């Protein structure tokens, strides 16, 4: 895994690299740590990851309701 990065009501867990493979970013809630939502990134860099973190704060992704 890479950069768990606990946020308020969610976790934004980029996966393990699954060697020789591009990692993916998924947004889980507190329970149900195996479902995953793809937030429609383009590259999954560190800057894209920080964009998704600062988008889970302030409460608007286009992909999840974010209660």
């Amino acid at each position: 895994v890479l950069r768990e990065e606990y946020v308020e009501g969610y976790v934004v867990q980029m996966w393990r690299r699954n060697p020789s493979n591009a990692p993916v970013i998924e947004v889980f809630t507190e329970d149900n740590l195996e479902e995953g939502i793809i937030p429609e990134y383009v590259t999954a860099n560190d800057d894209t990851f920080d964009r998704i973190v600062d988008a889970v704060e302030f409460g608007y992704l286009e992909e999840l309701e974010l209660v």
């Binding site: 308020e8 920080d50 600062d54 988008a55 704060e57 302030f58 409460g59 608007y60 286009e62 974010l66």
Partner: protein, 428 residues
């Protein structure tokens, strides 16, 4: 046929753990309404005051017993067997039970909870959405969100004298893009403030609170963040201010003490400062630019800028049937500030918006800086065509409840939903 049988308020806890009061209204057929009683601040004297226990040992003065007993033992025996689809008769009955002018017998919060539960029950009985029960069939125009971004003054420890800076995305096609634009501007500003090496923690109303040096530094940083996000300022993203000039107005001599810049300005130099800030930065709205006891300067300000900058005023148009109509006659300011949980019922809200639409003013839905919310304000902002809502809240789980409630209206108005954009600035 839909007669009220049970009006009942109880005490529940929020996400913060504070006690909140929750009013429920039952019918005969099974319709059901539910509204939250606010627990905010009681500033002002010429408007409707909110009533708590005031016990500092019980949540710093937010007691619930005197707010729930007034609903369960006074308001409730007067509303049995009454028809629930008659909102105006209920709003007259509640004021007749109150008796006084400032709602100080039952509290201006216990009346508003009942008068929105009895309007969310009638929209459930008729099986129409709530923004069409309150506003007709041609209520389809979502407001422009005013989104607090940088705090200063009293809310923080910095040399910024203006209290709140806001952004207003007006170049978006619909509300969802207008919310996405702000979601990206906040990330760009956090990037800029982390590049400068400041504190990027979320402050009071949702905005940041860094350690800045002047008002001009904040207006440089926000415009730089808007440019780095990819948008053009002045065409798509405007700004606004909440000056809160009452906090640095020395009453004994009548001079403004700008503690941030260390310069004491008189009442004729503040307007010269606001002209410079409007000429350099795309400000479109100024809130409480001068104190409400500075008529000789306020009459100057409302004509030096009042044709190209919106100038709202809260205590200048303080919410009453006599005092809000006082500042209309002499013509100072060109927008008023509708505060719902300080104004009473749902009939007086829609009369106070209509009396501002007549006299050429512009309504701005707002709230006192410490109240909680409810989620029915997002239906009042669509049903009245108010135009600007102020999506701030003391906690995140109320702010997101504003956002989701305004996004679940656009998803019902799918091929129909308008958006103001720049068309809300008609008097400029």
């Amino acid at each position: 046929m839909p007669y009220i049988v049970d009006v009942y308020a109880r005490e529940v806890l929020d996400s913060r753990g504070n006690p909140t009061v929750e009013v429920e209204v039952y019918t005969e057929t099974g319709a059901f309404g539910r509204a939250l009683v606010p627990s905010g601040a009681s500033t002002g004297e010429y408007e409707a005051v909110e009533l708590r226990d005031g016990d500092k040992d019980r949540y710093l003065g937010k007691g619930v017993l005197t707010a729930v007993n007034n609903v369960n033992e006074i308001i409730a025996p007067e509303l049995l067997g009454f028809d629930v689809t008659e909102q105006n008769a209920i709003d007259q009955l509640l004021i007749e039970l109150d008796g006084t002018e400032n709602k100080g017998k039952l509290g201006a919060n216990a009346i508003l909870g009942v008068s929105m539960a009895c309007a969310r029950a009638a929209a459930d009985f008729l099986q129409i959405p709530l923004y069409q029960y309150l506003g007709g069939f041609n209520s389809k125009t979502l407001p422009v969100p005013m989104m607090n971004i940088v705090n200063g003054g009293e809310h923080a420890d910095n040399n910024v004298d203006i209290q709140e800076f806001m952004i207003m995305p007006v170049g978006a096609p619909n509300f969802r893009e207008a919310l996405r634009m702000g979601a990206q501007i906040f990330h760009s500003l956090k990037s800029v403030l982390s590049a400068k090496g400041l504190n990027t923690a979320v402050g009071d109303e949702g905005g940041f609170a860094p350690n800045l040096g002047s008002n001009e530094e904040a207006l440089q940083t926000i415009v730089e963040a808007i440019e780095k996000a990819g948008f053009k300022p002045g065409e798509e993203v405007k700004l606004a201010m909440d000056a809160a000039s009452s906090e640095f107005y020395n009453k004994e001599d009548g001079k403004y003490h700008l503690s941030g810049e260390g310069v004491v300005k008189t009442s004729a130099e503040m307007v010269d400062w606001y002209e410079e800030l409007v000429s350099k930065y795309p400000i479109i709205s100024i809130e409480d630019g001068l104190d409400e006891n500075d008529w000789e300067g306020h009459k100057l300000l409302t004509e030096r800028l009042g044709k190209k900058v919106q100038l709202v005023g809260d205590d200048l148009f303080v919410t009453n049937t006599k005092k809000l109509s006082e500042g209309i006659k002499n013509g100072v300011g060109n927008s008023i500030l509708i505060k719902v949980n300080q104004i009473g019922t749902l009939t007086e809200t829609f009369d106070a918006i209509e009396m501002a639409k007549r006299a050429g003013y512009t309504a701005v839905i707002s709230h006192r800086s410490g109240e909680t919310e409810d989620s029915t304000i997002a239906d009042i902002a669509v049903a009245t065509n108010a135009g600007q809502i102020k999506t701030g809240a003391p906690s995140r789980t109320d702010r997101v409840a504003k956002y989701n409630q305004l996004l679940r209206i656009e998803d019902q108005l799918a091929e129909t939903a308008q958006y103001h954009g720049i068309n809300s600035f008609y008097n400029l």
